[PDB]
Amino acid sequence: VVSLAGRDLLCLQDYTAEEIWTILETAKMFKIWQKIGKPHRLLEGKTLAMIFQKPSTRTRVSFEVAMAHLGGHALYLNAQDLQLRRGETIADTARVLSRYVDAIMARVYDHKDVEDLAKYATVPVINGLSDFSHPCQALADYMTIWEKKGTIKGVKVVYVGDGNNVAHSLMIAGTKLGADVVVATPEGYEPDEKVIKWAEQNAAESGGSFELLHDPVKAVKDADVIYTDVWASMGQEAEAEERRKIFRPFQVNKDLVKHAKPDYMFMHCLPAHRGEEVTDDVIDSPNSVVWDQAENRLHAQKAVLALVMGGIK
Amino acid sequence: VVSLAGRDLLCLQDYTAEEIWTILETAKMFKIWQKIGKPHRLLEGKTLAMIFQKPSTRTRVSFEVAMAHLGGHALYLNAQDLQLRRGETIADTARVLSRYVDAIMARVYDHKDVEDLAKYATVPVINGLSDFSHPCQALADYMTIWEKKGTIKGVKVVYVGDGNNVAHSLMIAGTKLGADVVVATPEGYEPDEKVIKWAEQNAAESGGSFELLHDPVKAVKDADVIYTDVWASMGQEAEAEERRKIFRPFQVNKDLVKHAKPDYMFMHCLPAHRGEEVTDDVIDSPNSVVWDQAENRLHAQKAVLALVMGGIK
Amino acid sequence: VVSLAGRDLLCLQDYTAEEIWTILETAKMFKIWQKIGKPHRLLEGKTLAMIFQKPSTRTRVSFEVAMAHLGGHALYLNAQDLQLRRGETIADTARVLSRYVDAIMARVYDHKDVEDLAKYATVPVINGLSDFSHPCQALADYMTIWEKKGTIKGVKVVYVGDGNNVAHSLMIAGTKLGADVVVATPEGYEPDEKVIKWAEQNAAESGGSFELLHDPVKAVKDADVIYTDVWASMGQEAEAEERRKIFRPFQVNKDLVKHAKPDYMFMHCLPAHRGEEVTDDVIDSPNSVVWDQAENRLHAQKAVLALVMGGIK
Amino acid sequence: VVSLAGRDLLCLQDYTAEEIWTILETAKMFKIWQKIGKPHRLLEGKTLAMIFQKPSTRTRVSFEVAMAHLGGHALYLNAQDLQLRRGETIADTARVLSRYVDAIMARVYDHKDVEDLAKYATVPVINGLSDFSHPCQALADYMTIWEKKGTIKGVKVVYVGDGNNVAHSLMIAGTKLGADVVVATPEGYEPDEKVIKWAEQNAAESGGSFELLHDPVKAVKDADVIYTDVWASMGQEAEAEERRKIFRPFQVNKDLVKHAKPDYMFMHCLPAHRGEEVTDDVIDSPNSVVWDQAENRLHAQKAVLALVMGGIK
Amino acid sequence: VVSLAGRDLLCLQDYTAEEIWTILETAKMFKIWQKIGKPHRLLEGKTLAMIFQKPSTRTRVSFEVAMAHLGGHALYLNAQDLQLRRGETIADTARVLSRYVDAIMARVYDHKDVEDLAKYATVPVINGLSDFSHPCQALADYMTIWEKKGTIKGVKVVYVGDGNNVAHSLMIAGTKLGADVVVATPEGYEPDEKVIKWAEQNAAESGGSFELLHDPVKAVKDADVIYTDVWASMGQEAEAEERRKIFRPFQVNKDLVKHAKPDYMFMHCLPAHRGEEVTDDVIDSPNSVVWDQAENRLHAQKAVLALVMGGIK
Amino acid sequence: VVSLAGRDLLCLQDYTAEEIWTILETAKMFKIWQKIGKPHRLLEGKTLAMIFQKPSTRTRVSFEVAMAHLGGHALYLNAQDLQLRRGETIADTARVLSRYVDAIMARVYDHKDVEDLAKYATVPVINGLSDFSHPCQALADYMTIWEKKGTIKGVKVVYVGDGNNVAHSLMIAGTKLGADVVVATPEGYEPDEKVIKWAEQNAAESGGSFELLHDPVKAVKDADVIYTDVWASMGQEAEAEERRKIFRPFQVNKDLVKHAKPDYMFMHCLPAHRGEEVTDDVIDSPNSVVWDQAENRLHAQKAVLALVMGGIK
């Protein structure tokens, strides 16, 4: 294990497999503490400023509950209080905030904002969701796979659907952890080339693999976990619901799933659009693991805060 | 007294008189603890997610202060973060939330929502206000009557004005507790028939009574407590202020009150529209009890949280 | 030092120099406690209701972090939950709130509102910002000057730009503390005459001085600290950016500053509009003290809460 | 309330109504503490020797759990370890035991034994069950009636079946508490005359009443609570199951019960012989209260130990 | 890991591999805590009623010591106090007991009794030994194999001798955990067909295997652990010591063992009948692991109590 | 004083006078702690397994109360749970028990059993009573003499009656402590020759003495303490009450006692058979000290547990 004291968590490609393992182990520990009822208020009086430039309840309550469990306090800054680059330069808000709080967690559209926030920060900055990546989710996801499957190594996890931020992060972490990851997406909707390049170099070292495809049924062959997420042009509606014809084939359903292992795990980072990317039969099939996966958002984030704030000096 | 560990509080007709008494006694106890300065952080590290689909400060601060006193933490979810049936099925948000928090308190329009929330919950669900009922208010109200009057039994409490959610709850509880309750409302504005039926069966058992009327001065005869609330077509304005001509006669004022006992108590669940349902002379007369009644919202809710979360197993 | 138990903090002209010194000393103490890592949860279970009628992050997080450090809890009431004089008379909300919380801190436009709030309160009311004054800022400001300069007495602090609320408060406190204060503003934009009168009577007693001027370069002569703030017709834009021609001469820049002492301190209460009232060269010059000044908002407010709530009886 | 420090609890006729009320109030308090999860280890290191001359699980686990909750320790002495008058004079075992433990609770056949035990004791002696009386059960019983019914005063509690030890105690307490008690038993099986005499003198003072009868249906008329217990010649079997013909008419069943109030409570001190003294329809009817009644054995005994051992001097 | 809060432990076929792993991990943790001397009284004031319908010291002291370590209290109910279906219906004793204690652990002959106990319970019920299964032993056993061998997966554990309750449980767990399990028994003495069917379906999923045989030397080939237990017609004696001729060939001895791996582990759940199923040379050979295995009964049960009682809500 | 950490207490001839003094001093200390109400839970979480092969309440409750006072837990194993050499070799039960508990205290017939128990133990073994000796009683006895008489040295303690286990131990300790001990017994009923030899060698070193006699009146001449115990063929009854004619002369009574010092102390280890070995006049004469002596069983054993378990390493 290694110290992460004072670190930022913008993107996992900055992390070594050992650092990402440090967080999963501490998280497993905290999860057990919690199941047996053992208190662990390790951050009394510590404060975490959560800046939300676009709502997200799962992230807001998982970070807020995580801090409460550790005895600290998360303040919730909204878009009606905190636009970033509007009433003051991002550098200035970072400077002042770092005089009051102990760590910042930002949920922002433009990844460059969370990056600017970190550069002038002085206090650890965590990325709860940007358009480029979602690290906290990957940690929860691989934590889940690790719990259920017993290992992350030779597991074929395949993501089907639009290549977005969580897709990026599933690639970066799994490939760093040694998993054989494959992503299948409609032709013009594949992950950013930079992260694809990343995924391949990462893969060499962890004897994992990465593989882009454009045919779901091929991708999902003999899969251990099938993962999906909501799809493109979010806010599209009938007035550009085009995502339907193109993405529709990718919908995780009874038939697609049939190509995976009998004991495959279905994952989705929520929210689900039952009917689109996934059907009732799947999310609710006993192969579904969406809730344990949701829960691990609490444990995993509980570990990164303790690790990056607790290691004080 | 009885355990309420794990129970939901959607409507008091599900509660026995003993269960409602359990909460009032624990509440009286907590109120005394508070007056003498004795701490009682019985829920350290416990979290309560408050979902507000429509604002309400009295409820928001009474639940939030109640949890702070017990050492726990209430997270406040707004309408800009949490519409219910919009970005995800109510069943799904209930499932995920119940993986993070320890109890949910919802303030929603449609009572069916709080009901759906409870069905998929796994964690206790409390109804802070729906269009059908307001249990937390009745508990505070009867707690107040119990304090001041010394008993709830043979007390004639009469509600005058539109038959709404608090009207429903005043009927359900008082009639369960043995009070002689009467509700007087303009002809087309009387409580839901289902709760009226409830009130009558309940009344048989607690030797109380219920009685619908349509003439305030008759209703308020020899009354111990006269209760009122804001009136109909809320948001009506001059463009359908019709509530004026019809409801106006019901306005609790110096003359109406004159028919009640000399030592009658005036109650209102706030907010007051001084000038409409009640006049300055009344809410501010020494017969008014609106503030002690407001305060008991803290003590009563402090008891239901401790009772339904504290009794853990 | 003196007790401030139960006091309100609407405006510092109500305070004696000893009372304002009591708060600065307690604040210095709390700042040292904090630097050495010594806990001081003096207000466990205490709650502070923050009413924001107009956003302000620096105030919101400084009060919220201050209460967390003391072990209490601040509830944040927004404009979407709490308009003041809309759904209920300010007297009524004050009455009910004072049945739940231990102190109220209001950020409101009309100073008369914070004044009405205090009159019906029962619980201490603190003014986090009104259009007439900003006491919490002056305390932080003079605390900063006291730290850096070693004294407040014979220090010439000069404010340049529109005479607003913070201008009012810089005058009232500095002049009460014995500083030689001067305010320079464009001809039709000078501080309220009432506070100017105040500043002069105050000055007699503390052998300080006050002096209105309309020429920045004269004002800033041999100055110890040069202070500025954002300027007039806020929300003006190009459609009445008139503030430009008139205020432009007042812009704190390399040349203006050149008239001050070599070791002068530049202060600004933030937010800064780099380019308008101040330029990059100044706020970022090593003479700038804007961040220590921002930080002292935490320590100073931490002292007023402890002082006005801690002294319980 | 009054001190019971150092007292013995052999029979309730030695207790005043105030003393029996002291124990019920302390018990109600402890019950609430328990429902909210508030610890109360008031007897750390204290030990209670339980002597069982004839098995009884309900008593053994209720006393043992009660002491664990208070942080003390109950040692369980069986008939294979402790016959009383066999290997040593009862006076001698009492003397030695009182050098080791803090209170003794004995479950013995001959009431004279528990009486001898107390005479040489030095340490409080509690009677968990003798052939003459069962005080701990009456306390639980009247506690239950008090909880459910709201008072003990004008409540008609009627016991039907063999007049035994619990019958004795129901008479002694209820009549001391002001209840209108009636006992109906087959002709040759009525309570001891001494306790019947007691019941009548007691009744005068508490405006209650007592009344022996020999016709169940008459006895149960308009009853609030109908109570029964197992019946005569225990161990009789077919070889003297005579109790059948004679007692059979007394069996609490659907028809008998029909004469009581609609909201009557059915009580039984357990064990039940479903089929004999009571039928499935009754013990399991929602009018049955046998389990809350069983539970109150814990709370009531928790109060007598705390009261008679806690009040140390 | 997963919550087991409120669960019963009658048979491990109800448990997922993850749930059984949750308990082993928590157990490993508690074992380390214990070796370093770190306290963990996680269940203060909690009580566990142990019902023994047939003696068993190893189980009685392991559960009793486990609860003492956690700060709770186990009450021991014997056959002289608690026959089940004798003086009262099993449903009734379950109801009353669940009003006093926090969990029940039963050691009974007929598995249907422990099943009935759980159905009317309200409080978690643990099966310490029935004629169908012994879950607590399997957990200890696989915990031991996991410690020593480093994994449970590809380990060939073979059980030789009468197919009884522990045989059932070794099959159910090992096969659920992925081990290659084989059971060899004399022709008419093989495990129940239902559990054999279970073992095979379970095996498919955990890439383990199961295999019934009737020739010990074949069974023990290349085995990692050789397990045995006492044999048939217990209480048989010379007057039906028939078990001798038939079972004798199965006796684990120097020769049989010789077919296993050099580093094989010998396990037995005790009591041993040195001379029958195993010889001095084996139980005492350095390949024997019977005591570490016995010890893990403490750690494993310490984990299930903490897990099923500690996770309170 | 000296450490006794990890020691066994089978027989006091293994102990030096300093070791036996270490225990008496620690015992005196614990007795004072207890009289002033000072807690001393020195063995939290520690467990003591008491194995009783033949009942004994005084020993069972003194060890059980002693452990409760120290915050540990004694488990009571009976003859219906633990025969020693029946269902498993004594070596095996010792091995397993020593994996669960922290010390063992055995009450067994055959001293060789307690000796075998200790040989395979790993955990301290204490002998609460065997047929050869009763160490815990001697410690209490000499503690008593030490308290009352002020010293043990030149005190003539004489034992009259059958030479049994306590006789053995009175000889071994007193003679080790320097007392002048004499034992008088009917001709064929004198202490084992081995311990008599012991007593004489021991006596040389502590300038005490030992002396066997067969005439009580001579023995009791000028005695400081006269000690007796129950007599021979226990279970004899009229069908071999022969002990009467032979032992009768030895009965401690008014006349015999008359030969002792005026301030002599009468001791008996209980149980007393008032009428046989001693008469009412003696055990109850103010010269009797049987109860203080009984009480010191608690203090003395409280010291050996703390000493042999507390000194951990």
From Swiss-Prot, chains A, B, C, D, E, F:
Gene3D superfamilies: Aspartate/ornithine carbamoyltransferase. InterPro entries: Asp/Orn_carbamoyltranf_P-bd (IPR006132), Asp/Orn_carbamoylTrfase (IPR006130), Asp/Orn_carbamoylTrfase_sf (IPR036901), Asp_carbamoyltransf_Asp/Orn-bd (IPR006131), Orn/put_carbamltrans (IPR002292), OTCase_ArgI (IPR024904). Carbamoyl phosphate binds at residues 56-59, 83, 107, 134-137, 269-270, 297. Its EC number is 2.1.3.3. Optimum pH is 6.5 (at 55 degrees Celsius). It holds the Pfam family OTCace. Changing residue 25 to Q: Increased dissociation of dodecamers into trimers. It comes from the Archaea. Extreme thermal stability. It maintains about 50% of its activity after heat treatment for 60 minutes at 100 degrees Celsius. Inhibited by the bisubstrate delta-N-phosphonoacetyl-L-ornithine (PALO). Changing residue 240 to D: Becomes active at low temperatures. GO terms for biological process: arginine biosynthetic process via ornithine; citrulline biosynthetic process; L-arginine biosynthetic process. Pathway: Amino-acid biosynthesis; L-arginine biosynthesis; L-arginine from L-ornithine and carbamoyl phosphate: step 1/3. It interacts physically with carbamoyl-phosphate synthetase (CKase), forming a channeling cluster for carbamoyl phosphate. This prevents the thermodenaturation of carbamoyl phosphate, an extremely thermolabile and potentially toxic metabolic intermediate. Reversibly catalyzes the transfer of the carbamoyl group from carbamoyl phosphate (CP) to the N(epsilon) atom of ornithine (ORN) to produce L-citrulline, which is a substrate for argininosuccinate synthetase, the enzyme involved in the final step in arginine biosynthesis. Belongs to the aspartate/ornithine carbamoyltransferase superfamily. OTCase family. The monomer folds into two domains of similar size. The N-terminal domain is the carbamoylphosphate-binding domain; ornithine binds to the C-terminal domain. Homododecamer (tetramer of trimers). This is Ornithine carbamoyltransferase, anabolic. It comes from Pyrococcus furiosus (strain ATCC 43587 / DSM 3638 / JCM 8422 / Vc1).
